[PDB]
Amino acid sequence: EKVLYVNNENEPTSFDPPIGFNNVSWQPLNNIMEGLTRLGKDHEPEPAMAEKWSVSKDNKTYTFTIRENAKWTNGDPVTAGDFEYAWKRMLDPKKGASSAFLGYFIEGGEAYNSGKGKKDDVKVTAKDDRTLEVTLEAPQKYFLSVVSNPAYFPVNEKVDKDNPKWFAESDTFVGNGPFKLTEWKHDDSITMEKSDTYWDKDTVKLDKVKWAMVSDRNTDYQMFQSGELDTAYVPAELSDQLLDQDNVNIVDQAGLYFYRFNVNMEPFQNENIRKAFAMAVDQEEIVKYVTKNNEKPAHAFVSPGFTQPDGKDFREAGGDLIKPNESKAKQLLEKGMKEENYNKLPAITLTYSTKPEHKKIAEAIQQKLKNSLGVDVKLANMEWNVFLEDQKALKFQFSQSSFLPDYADPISFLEAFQTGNSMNRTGWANKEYDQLIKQAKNEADEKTRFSLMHQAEELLINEAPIIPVYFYNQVHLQNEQVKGIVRHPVGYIDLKWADKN
Numbered sequence: 426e427k428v429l430y431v432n433n434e435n436e437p438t439s440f441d442p443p444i445g446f447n448n449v450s451w452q453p454l455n456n457i458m459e460g461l462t463r464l465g466k467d468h469e470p471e472p473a474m475a476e477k478w479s480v481s482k483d484n485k486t487y488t489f490t491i492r493e494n495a496k497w498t499n500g501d502p503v504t505a506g507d508f509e510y511a512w513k514r515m516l517d518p519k520k521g522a523s524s525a526f527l528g529y530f531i532e533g534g535e536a537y538n539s540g541k542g543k544k545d546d547v548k549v550t551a552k553d554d555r556t557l558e559v560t561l562e563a564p565q566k567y568f569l570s571v572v573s574n575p576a577y578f579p580v581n582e583k584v585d586k587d588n589p590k591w592f593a594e595s596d597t598f599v600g601n602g603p604f605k606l607t608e609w610k611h612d613d614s615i616t617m618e619k620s621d622t623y624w625d626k627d628t629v630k631l632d633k634v635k636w637a638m639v640s641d642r643n644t645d646y647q648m649f650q651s652g653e654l655d656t657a658y659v660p661a662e663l664s665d666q667l668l669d670q671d672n673v674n675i676v677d678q679a680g681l682y683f684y685r686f687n688v689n690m691e692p693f694q695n696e697n698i699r700k701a702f703a704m705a706v707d708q709e710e711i712v713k714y715v716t717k718n719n720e721k722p723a724h725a726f727v728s729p730g731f732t733q734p735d736g737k738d739f740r741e742a743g744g745d746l747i748k749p750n751e752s753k754a755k756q757l758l759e760k761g762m763k764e765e766n767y768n769k770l771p772a773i774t775l776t777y778s779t780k781p782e783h784k785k786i787a788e789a790i791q792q793k794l795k796n797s798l799g800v801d802v803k804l805a806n807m808e809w810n811v812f813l814e815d816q817k818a819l820k821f822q823f824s825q826s827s828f829l830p831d832y833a834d835p836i837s838f839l840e841a842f843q844t845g846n847s848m849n850r851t852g853w854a855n856k857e858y859d860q861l862i863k864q865a866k867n868e869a870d871e872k873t874r875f876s877l878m879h880q881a882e883e884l885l886i887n888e889a890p891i892i893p894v895y896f897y898n899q900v901h902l903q904n905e906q907v908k909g910i911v912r913h914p915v916g917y918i919d920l921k922w923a924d925k926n
Contacts, residue, residue, distance in 0.1 A: 426632045427925040429907060430655045432645055433636040436612045440592040442578040443515040443522035448917075451575045453636055455917035457617055459602040460579070461489050461508070461557075461572040464916050468732070468833075470569040474503055474579065474601065475557075484564035484869070485532070486548075489557040496622040497581050499599050505551035507579040512549045513537075514585075515576055524576035527831060530568060532560045566871060570833035573916060603629050603921035613638055630909075630924040655904040655925070664717045672903055675719055679730030679914040680829040680897035681838075683723070684775070684790070688890050689852040690822045691771045697761030698770075699889040703747055704754040705797040706790060706892050715789045716782070718900050723893035724748060727838045727882055730914030734871040739835050740896075743879050746886035747893070751797045758798050773802040777825035778812040786894065787825065816850050826850075829897070833915040835878050836865060842885050853890035 437450040442458060445451055461478075462470035475489040495503035514520065516528040518540045529535040531549055536542025548560035561568060571577065584591050584599045591597045595609040603625065604617035615636040619629050639645055642658055649657035656674075659667050667673065686693040686702075693699050708722030721729065724745035731739040762770065775791060777783040787804050794800045802823065807815075816824055828848070830837035841848035843859050861881040868874040885891075899912050906926055911919040 427630065428633045428635055429631050429920065429923060429925055430635050430653060431637070432639050432648070432654055432657065433615065434640050434645075435638055437615075440598065440606075442511070442580065442592075443520075443524045443576045445575070446523040451917045453615055453617070454575050454578075455602070456604050456634065456920050457598070457600040457602045457606045457620075458575065458578040460574070460577050462569055463921075464570065464573050464833075464911075464913050464919065466911055466922060468913050468916070470573055473573070474508075475572075478569070484566075485561045487559045487561075487568065488552075489559070491555045491557065492624055493555070495601065495624050497584075497599050497601050498605050498620060498622050499581070499584070500622065501581060501583065501599075502554065503579060503581075503601050504554040505557035506554065507582055508557050508577075509549050509551040510582040510585070511578065511580040513544055513547055514580060516547060517544075522576070524574075527571060527574060527576045530561055530565060530571060532562045535562075563866065564869065565834075567832060567834040570915070574832070575917065604631075604634060607633075625921070629921050631920065634920055649902050652904075655907050656910070657902045659718065659900055659902055661717070667902070668717075668719060668900075670902075672905055674899075674901045674903045674910075674912075676899050676912050677721075677729045677914045678829075678897035678899050678912075679728045679833075680827070681723055681726060681728050682720075682786070682894045682897070683726075683826045683828070684892040684894065685816070685821070685824050685826045685851045686890055686892075687819055687822050687852055689819070692761070692765065692767065692773070693822060695761040695765050696888060697757045697764065701754045701758035701761060701798060702794065702800075703889040703892045704750050704757065705794055706894070707749040707793065708894055709749070710793070711786060711789055712895050715785055716895060718898070720895040720898055723896050725882065726842075726885055726891065726893055727835050727878075728896040728914075731833065731835045733875050739875070739878075743882060746883055747889070754797060758800075770800055773800070773822055774805050775802045775823045775825075776805045776807070776812070776815075776821045778809045779806045780809075783825055817847070819850060819852060826891070830915055835875075835882075836862070837915075839865070839878055839881050839885075842890070851890040853885075853888065855884065855888065858884050 435449050438445040439450055440454055459473050461475040463473035465471040474495050476492045478487050478489045480487055491505055515522050516525050516534050516538045518538055525538050533542055533547040537544055537547045550558045552558050581599045588597055595606045598606045603623050605620040607618045608616035618633045645657050646660045648654040686699050712720045712722050724747055729738055729740045733739055775787055777787045791802050843862055844854040858881055861877050865874050865877040909923040
């Protein structure tokens with residue numbers, strides 16, 4: 426019996442597909458449920474519940490054909506109606522799903538979700554049991570990746586009306602993915618087994634996947650050492666000894682660790698002062714001496730992890746947009762302080778959320794700004810929830826930031842810095858940038874759309890409302906016997922191609 430032993434760390438928030446909206450829920454859920462597409466080993470969407478699709482001449486209307494022999498674990502066929510049901514449920518104004526915004530891509534979805542528009546005017550329709558027609562608000566070539574997201578998973582409508590809490594327990598769960606949920610001991614473990622009803626069961630080579638719930642990183646390592654976990658985190662303490670070994674897996678995760686300025690709070694209303702701070706930071710030093718998990722230093726906003734029409738990575742094709750340079754940074758600071766008539770900089774506080782990682786990086790930033798520019802910043806820390814909310818409320822001059830994209834396209838990053846966007850949180854308000862984003866969202870030629878997005882990024886970095894620090898990755902110790910795990914830059918772990926031999 427081939428059993429893959431992994432650690433989920435904690436109890437899933439929810440297996441009701443649109444609700445969890447996080448790794449602890451969606452990493453396992455992705456392996457017991459299945460959407461119209463699934464991201465493959467090269468991260469491109471491939472046919473999953475949909476055998477095939479056609480797109481209308483205006484690029485707005487998709488017609489999915491459901492696989493003829495797709496089934497639920499209770500033997501029921503997976504139908505286009507199960508998708509219509511699920512997507513309208515995900516958008517329901519009364520359900521308050523945290524992932525509902527991803528449903529806004531469907532025409533009528535945002536209006537329905539707002540309480541303004543009718544359910545029937547949301548353009549997802551089961552034309553028959555095998556045919557799902559979907560009309561988008563606007564053409565998006567990456568919609569085929571969006572429908573691999575768990576928010577877009579189907580729900581067996583008969584099962585949901587019979588037991589509206591079917592997803593809360595293994596014994597009532599009805600799923601359609603490569604594995605079947607067979608045990609769920611809340612706060613302890615999950616077990617899933619190769620699913621006999623699955624259309625592609627012959628591809629699935631693991632008999633079972635077992636998911637622990639161990640949040641103690643120290644116990645996580647002991648369990649790897651002892652063979653009780655097949656995958657595990659690299660202990661930070663022992664990074665320098667272990668990171669070089671052949672059993673460490675490192676892959677991209679799209680996302681960015683950065684700092685935000687508030688461009689309306691002194692002294693960061695001055696572009697030269699922001700640019701000086703941004704150019705003083707040395708991201709190579711942070712990753713080499715502080716984080717020490719082989720993260721890529723960030724010299725741009727959009728991370729590795731997005732493919733272009735030519736097959737290149739977006740970040741690789743755009744290049745570095747800000748280069749560390751101490752002597753130039755000093756000149757820019759001196760120029761900005763002269764513009765503002767500052768004899769000394771106004772007091773600056775660097776605020777972060779309480780966590781050891783964040784404190785170490787903030788202390789390194791503080792020391793670097795002192796050594797390279799002669800500037801003093803004070804540190805402040807507070808609990809995550811209050812920190813996050815105060816950041817949204819633009820309370821902080823200078824604050825730790827994290828961004829993870831919601832979907833597999835660079836526009837997910839770049840739309841964040843439009844004027845007044847909820848993910849902006851800096852006050853930065855650039856009409857030229859806003860126009861470029863608008864043009865990108867209305868551009869039919871993908872190569873030109875990608876150019877517009879590079880143009881936008883260059884303008885953002887040039888005005889420095891942020892300081893990029895590092896790009897996210899996924900680092901694991903992995904049993905040499907285990908092959909074929911797929912961890913996507915944008916999306917959730919896929920185990921259906923994994924083997925243990």
